[PDB]
């Protein structure tokens, strides 16, 4: 009984795309009874590791905390949201790849820096300025000299 | 590449029992290379996506913010509130149908433009004049002309 | 207690310029304790006539009902708020000028349209569409023709 | 010309009461020619001007919008919230000082840049990068070179 509108058991499937670099399956189902079509998300029953914050406190992985940081650094940058979601899926993929119960907050940060360098070099400097907490304006020139390698 | 352990593309499926009172599909998957087994949960996304506003800020979907815009354009028009609620439910339905975490504010606008075109063509012009921010009176005539060619056919 | 920052009772006055062609008095006041400068507008509270609505019901004059209708028509338009307030003050001035107990809602609407024609011609069409309740899309072309030829 | 009925310049004042907590001055004026007595209300102009956005659209002044921008630039900076509120009150003060019904969004941004230069020079660069929408990493070096002369 997959239909949520008329509550009919059989629901025919139309499409089956692979989103999130293979982490989940998006399907385009439609019920035979009513003329209503909807989307479904088949995801694997595994957990993203816990985050080991700067103050050694463990916290559940929140992809929105990760995303918001990136969007603040990308403020007026011409980087599409599909590229951002691709970078977020790749960082999650690499976090899963460790096979650890928990990952430090510093590891997530470095993986974002790794994506932002590819996405936008201005946005990368904006992120590093707060991520690495710049205490002098000279820290900006040092990150640029580091990036012109 | 559905495998989460070794990252192999092809993942064979073994079982498929409908669980959660038919609301979701619990399946058993097995990798072909690492030979591990895991559980899958296919659920319908029925939550309303976030709105990516004109200033790139994300905002929760507010059906009242959608309805007010329509009622301003539908001022003094003979379109009943049951037709308005039907149009609002159809726009929400189409927004759910995308299967997205967030939809742009522009997508919502285009969807109410097609509903208002069906509901009231005077109300549609009123909405389009602010939605598309008309800067000249000639823009009004252009929207009417690029409407009368459709009715002609 | 005229000071709004430190809440001191005595507030000394330095300047007094008559603004709005005598309709109000601008004055600079500077607190004695916090020493900060601010403006105070002395304006007259006058009687505005009652509004005889489309359904012949009388209603007190509403400067916000008047302003909101204009701002709905003036959506996304580049017309400054000083020009808007000038237009609203001129309509109120003309309403008072009749010297009548009550004015019809139709009189208010015509006066608003006279101001919107000067302010923004796109906004004028938006207002006229709801004000004159357009029943066909051809009503839009008629209002545009009614301005392009006879100014 | 304070008289609104006959339009006479000189208007004699008779009374001078106060709006509760001295927030306003009620007056009872009388014309010398038409001899009419009307009421006056002198109140402090504390409402903030409208913001003329980058796309010439007018918007009400939103303190949260102004403050949020500063707090994003002042992330992890040792600038206390009392200094931030002082800078926000000084920008609002300068906005009322113009005596205009509306101020451009660009003027607000320059006044924030003026405060952030005093508050934190790292935070000033962070604000300048988005405010002046940097399109190249070289824009950062240019803003720093501008600052190192003084
Ligand atoms: N719970 C979380 N889930 C996912 N990403 C997180 C989470 N907490 C932090 N992050 C991300 O980790 C990266 C680095 O974190 P950061 O360097 O800020 O350290 P922290 O110890 O989490 O402290 P804070 O967030 O207060 O700075 C950033 O991209 C941030 O958005
Ligand atoms: N949070 C929201 N939830 C639902 N509908 C919304 C929301 N925000 C805006 N809308 C609707 O989206 C459509 C188009 O929005 P619009 O073109 O106005 O752009 P915007 O970027 O949201 O800016 P604004 O609302 O200031 O015009 C309108 O029907 C509007 O009512
Ligand atoms: N009480 C009021 N005070 C001031 N202006 C008013 C008042 N009521 C209506 N107006 C204004 O009068 C103008 C014309 O009014 P309108 O043509 O809308 O007629 P109405 O009989 O008031 O009906 P409705 O407001 O329902 O349309 C508009 O600018 C409107 O904002
Ligand atoms: N309505 C508002 N009230 C108060 N401050 C505002 C308002 N809108 C913008 N600001 C502030 O004005 C300053 C400069 O604005 P900005 O340069 O961003 O231009 P804008 O035309 O408002 O466009 P944007 O949407 O990109 O901010 C910033 O400090 C911003 O926070
Ligand atoms: N204003 C900003 N400009 C550019 N990058 C920013 C800005 N604010 C945050 N970031 C980036 C770099 C930060 O290290 C990263 C994460 O932001 P941060 O405030 O540390 O919170 P967080 O996402 O770790 O969550 P929390 O504060 O709850 O621990 O986002
Ligand atoms: N006066 C009006 N006449 C006709 N249609 C209008 C009018 N005002 C708004 N609309 C229509 C077109 C607009 O693009 C749409 C949405 O209203 P708008 O004022 O833009 O705010 P919104 O609901 O999109 O977001 P927000 O609440 O964040 O401003 O409604
Ligand atoms: N969507 C709109 N677009 C443009 N102008 C509008 C819009 N809605 C209203 N107006 C303008 C033209 C209308 O004749 C005028 C008055 O608005 P209306 O909703 O009739 O209320 P009102 O101000 O007369 O109060 P009330 O309806 O309570 O009597 O405002
Ligand atoms: N991530 C950031 N790091 C540093 N400064 C920032 C950041 N984001 C914004 N700012 C500063 C500089 C911007 O010009 C200023 C205002 O932000 P902006 O996104 O332009 O919106 P705003 O406050 O003008 O409102 P809106 O865009 O909704 O009209 O705040
Ligand atoms: Zn069904
Ligand atoms: Zn495997
Ligand atoms: Zn923004
Ligand atoms: Zn109404
Ligand atoms: Zn004081
Ligand atoms: Zn609005
Ligand atoms: Zn008609
Ligand atoms: Zn007199
Ligand atoms: Zn924080």
Author numbering:
A (entry chain B): 1 to 149
B (entry chain C): 1 to 153
C (entry chain D): 1 to 151
D (entry chain A): 1 to 150
Article sentences:
NrdR is a bacterial transcriptional repressor consisting of a zinc (Zn)‐ribbon domain followed by an ATP‐cone domain. NrdR binds specifically to two “NrdR boxes” upstream of ribonucleotide reductase operons, of which Escherichia coli has three: nrdHIEF, nrdDG and nrdAB, in the last of which we identified a new box. Tetrameric forms of EcoNrdR involve alternating interactions between pairs of Zn‐ribbon domains and ATP‐cones. Our results, in combination with a previous structural and biochemical study, point to highly flexible EcoNrdR structures that, when loaded with the correct nucleotides, adapt to an optimal promoter‐binding conformation.
We present crystal structures of EcoNrdR–ATP–dATP and EcoNrdR–ADP–dATP, which are the first high‐resolution crystal structures of an NrdR. We show that E. coli NrdR (EcoNrdR) has similar binding strength to all three sites when loaded with ATP plus deoxyadenosine triphosphate (dATP) or equivalent diphosphate combinations. No other combination of adenine nucleotides promotes binding to DNA. The structures reveal considerable flexibility in relative orientation of ATP‐cones vs Zn‐ribbon domains.
